[PDB]
Ligand binder design. Sequence first.
Ligand SMILES: Nc1ncnc2c1ncn2[C@@H]1O[C@H](COP(=O)(O)OP(=O)(O)NP(=O)(O)O)[C@@H](O)[C@H]1O
Ligand SMILES: OC[C@H]1O[C@@H](O)[C@H](O)[C@@H](O)[C@@H]1O
Length: 378
Amino acid sequence: PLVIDEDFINQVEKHYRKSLKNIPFQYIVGVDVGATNTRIAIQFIINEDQDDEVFMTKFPCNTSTHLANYLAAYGKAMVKAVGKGSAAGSIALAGPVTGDKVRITNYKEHDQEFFYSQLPDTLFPASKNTFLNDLEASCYGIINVGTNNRLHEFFCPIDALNNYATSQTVRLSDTSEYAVLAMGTGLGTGLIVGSAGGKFNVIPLEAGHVHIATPGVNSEHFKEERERIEFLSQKIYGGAYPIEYEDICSGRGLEFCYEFEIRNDPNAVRKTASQIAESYSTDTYARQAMITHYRYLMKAAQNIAVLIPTCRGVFFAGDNQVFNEDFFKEHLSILQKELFQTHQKKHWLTDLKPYRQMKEYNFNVKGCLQKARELAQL
Ligand SMILES: Nc1ncnc2c1ncn2[C@@H]1O[C@H](COP(=O)(O)OP(=O)(O)NP(=O)(O)O)[C@@H](O)[C@H]1O
Ligand SMILES: OC[C@H]1O[C@@H](O)[C@H](O)[C@@H](O)[C@@H]1O
């Protein structure tokens, strides 16, 4: 009763039939589990270690049970299509990885725990798999693009008026550390950490779930900032808890911000995150909600840069960042001031280099496939 993507499976079978019946081959698996959709990538390998074709599909999923069932079904279809299981598999999930489980933060709350044991061995063979956080996987994808000297094709300095970037102005130094943040359904955060010798490690973070502090009592917009922080505590938690960065820096958080802006307008109607991002030019409430949404993204990055004294750069990543580039560039001055000026430790941040993604790319799946490639020991 689980519908396999027919186009995907026919492509895999057609490729097996035309190209793989009489040569040695393997395949590695990369799975990108977001809060509302999961992507599966199959990368074939021939000639011991050469990339062959990659095939991808995606399905709606927001419970752990459904995710386990879909992965089991895709494992059986793959074995049926090409005659054997994968050589290695990597899965990245939108939650904190603690040992042998992940709690997928924005899956339905009654069924968000996914365990290592729910991986099908057909796609994740024993001792040949990794359990990753989604933003952690993006970091490995970013490292890998950096190694291939293409980081400046996907990111530019936030103040690049014409998106100009070079291998000199956008690069990863193996003696530096970088924060990565990506606003989507949730606020993903992580650290890329260099080691002399060109090696990079990734530190997973859950900074999207630390509490937002209120600005100083004599700061310019104190009254409104505090009013919003209290309004949202009431709305999201009944006031039992204060808000996290993700309660503003997310799709649902953008919608909450808009509802705050329109709260005293009896004629205003709430808008979805998409409608807000599309209509900020003609709807001043949407502009203000967008400004708030991205201002607190800057504060989240500022919080990490104060927390991590060796943090030298920050990458604002994700497809949403690319989609909102016009808004971001039009309000650059406001967002730089938020990042660099609104902390008494601003002199610690003077040299922080911020970058924004300027081309769509699935760094998650890229990180997964590279991790699986290493595990496969080709
Ligand atoms: N331009 C936009 N700006 C901000 N948020 C947006 C925008 N468009 C959509 N959203 C919201 O952002 C979320 C989707 O972000 P996206 O990057 O596509 O996915 P994700 O968080 O990485 N994972 P997934 O839920 O599986 O798609 C939803 O909550 C949308 O309502
Ligand atoms: O998807 C972005 C982020 O969403 C958050 O709610 C999760 O807790 C993180 O683990 C994830 O990286």
